[PDB]
């Protein structure tokens, strides 16, 4: 359970910015939205500030914050992203479009204010004029994918792998082989995970109003590929839990038999209890007794408080 | 109902022996019979193995096994006698006759395998010849009496008060002021009482056949002094102690199972603690969990303080 | 708050017995009933076992257990009667009928079993043949009266005074000047009161069925004549009480503002609380904080437990 | 909002003095200006009272009053700076330049009646002449930065981490790795924080008129790092601490009033206690009583342990 975990508890705002060059066409882009790591939901609008954009959008969807993925509790000691926070992390990539060129990305994903920021620097090269890319042949959508995460301790960081599928107007498909590295800027302790992955599912819409080359992006991102946890710590929660999910229902209706048979009111309550007390303990002591006793008091209090 | 109680369901036999000294005349007496605590009944013959008994019989009736009282059903937890068994108890008293002397008695009421026994050491001092005692002036009866008991938790024992009236040939009466104390010798979970009392009624006969100086003796003896309030509560007070060792048993054996997993240090104890905690509750709450939880901080505080 | 107090908590059964002689006419009487000191109520039937009774009944109503009077809490350290218990007390009287003879009474009012007993011995003398008494001139009823109690330490007991009014068939009235003494049989500690009194009110009925000279008696008996108590101990209960009868209503609707604004459920409860905890205490500590905290938890628990 | 906080509602003046040694060249510098924490604003001129300043100005910008940050409204309880005032605090740090030397600094930020002051003692050691520092190679800017704070409760102080980037004429960059610690000197109820951070943005100008080696310096500085969860709880966490000293005050002065009535002994303490208790509750119960009650067992445990 990381400290940096604790930022993303609610919604968190987000700004993103990028300076691109691909085969010399330069450009820049800026975007805004919110993300809720708790529901593993993320919402964003992007606009190109050099006006028209030389590449089709989805190419960048990746490039454009895995801090916002939902890790459930058994897995929460594997959330690297949030641990590196607030000081953040550097995310470098190399994205190989198959049969075409490539992207190099470097980015700092860090907190500035109560805001989170992705500052990205991009260089594409060797693409082809009629390539899928420069021919704006890619459809406007995104498939789901899996992002495979494995710890790299030589770097006090992680390595990440996957491949991206951009459907084509044809019915053909284009592959983007994603190779990635995330290295904390902070010198603090981070969380290094066991191998696991993330399940991104995605949708690309547009803003009816907005007139500029833009993209509106939604991502759901959920963490998985582990079941036991640090197994017997969080598995303490199997038996301490049904110890109680049975203990409650064991005795609580002869408990109520005693309250329907002692009909206590606030006047007598104290005396009632205290008498049961010293007298019950004159028997002997263990905790085995000591518990039961106040089990009665919570259940007692409830009978008085409700009755009145 | 301590085991050592569940012994008296039916009849049980008895022997008694005593060695007196009173104003220098010594003697001994021994006797035999049975008693049934189920009905609070007792039966004995006493024959003086020194032949002539220098003191009137009724004086000794007291000295001469209170385990044999009927403890009624609601009171079963105030029987100190049926608890010290089978290991038994040492009963000693001091007896002040009005305008006359005293007896100090020491004795052990202990159990032997089947038969229950009283060996008694009595020390008389300072009586008057035309006095009631040495004159065999008190008549051959016994009255009813009440016997008042209070826990002395300081001794893991008990303390007792009563005072007895020996009618006299005079038509007068004589007092014997009795102060008594019991110190259970078996070291066990003896039962220590709330304040209460017992009521003797009694009779002295003789056997036509037997020619030795003797006495044949019967007692009905019953416990009381708990009326409705104290009953209906203090019954809740044991009925809770019952579920209190149902619990005590069933669980603290999956406990060591995990303490033997960590290896507490008193150092890391403070954290390891707050941690197994929050994860377990993330489930949900009622007390059924809450009890279970610190039954462990107790079986843990005992495993760090004992190992080390 | 006496130990012997604790017998009378519920209803307690009662037997009464008497051996009379007045001007030589001898008689005896026996009776049964219950009494509840808690409501200060007492109920009894009496029958004459020598058949017809030489005196009119009400003469005895007094003679025939002040243990059964209700002392309220401020006065409860003045209940002498119940303190002397279980060993009980001896009640002697002398009752002077004015212009007529007198009664002497001695009685032992003590516990035998779970039963309370009044054993009474009576001697009347010097009455007149046509006196109100032997002429059975007294009406059948009882007025209310006051019984004035003053402590007598020379006797580790009390002295008691009052005067009794037996209306007459005439419209005339007959006076019975009551002088009384109550001395514990027990050697224990008793409660010695400040001067105070008891307020008896009484009714004399008959049993339609029962054919023997009898009387059926009801007495309500309540204690009074004191207001402060041991004043500043039980007066602690003025300010510790409105400290709370205001404290409750001070903050409990912004408390509820926080629960209607935290909408807690059993899942999150623990986490919720614990966070408020260390963070609230990082401020500083006193108890002044420490209280408030769990004031929230009782009020929290109630919001979860009820909701669900 | 500690008093020592309620000081900064408006503008406040400032003086600064420093005495450096770096690779044996020493110097001193002193400066003047104002700052307003209400808007998180700060303004200063620095003039080198040794004339020529041997190190580039930006190096010192850091060393050169964090009380002047805007702590936003929800965060008011994490301001360690505005708490140590007026008595002030000692801030010392150590600064590691990459591939170059260090500065150790000691200083006291203390308040004098109206003006706030920094006297600084700086110790430089081991730098390189063609190095960035001694070569006045770093350009005349400053970047934005984030500053990360954690409570060190062990010092009743705090500990701090950040790292700063001085752009260089090269186009390169140089790091200055800052580690800092504050030990409040006034011994008081200082406020110790949850983990959080602050964000500087800054500018370096010069004055045309002034001919001494100088620097004119402005900082916007704001606190953040608490998002919704931790806010909405930890606001409950102070808002409870508020009612927690409403309470703390109002009452523990009728307390001594009664401890001064009894004369506890540690001996009779155990009973006197259980007793004032039951009588008070006989009234009725809710917690409003319960709190009040043991606020006393604490102000009592302190009156028996202190008197004796």
Numbering used by the authors:
A (entry chain A), B (entry chain B), C (entry chain A), D (entry chain B): 1 to 64, 68 to 232, 1066 to 1144
Passage from the reporting paper:
Among them, the multi-domain proapoptotic Bcl-2 proteins such as Bax (Bcl-2-associated X protein) and Bak (Bcl-2 antagonist/killer) are the gateway to mitochondrial dysfunction and cell death. Upon activation, Bax and Bak oligomerize and permeabilize the mitochondrial outer membrane by forming large pores1415161718192021. Various biochemical and biophysical studies have shown that Bax and Bak form homodimers first and they further oligomerize to form pores915232425262728. The core of the human Bax or Bak homodimer, known as “BH3-in-groove homodimer (BGH),” is formed by symmetric association of two identical polypeptides consisting of helices α2-α52529.
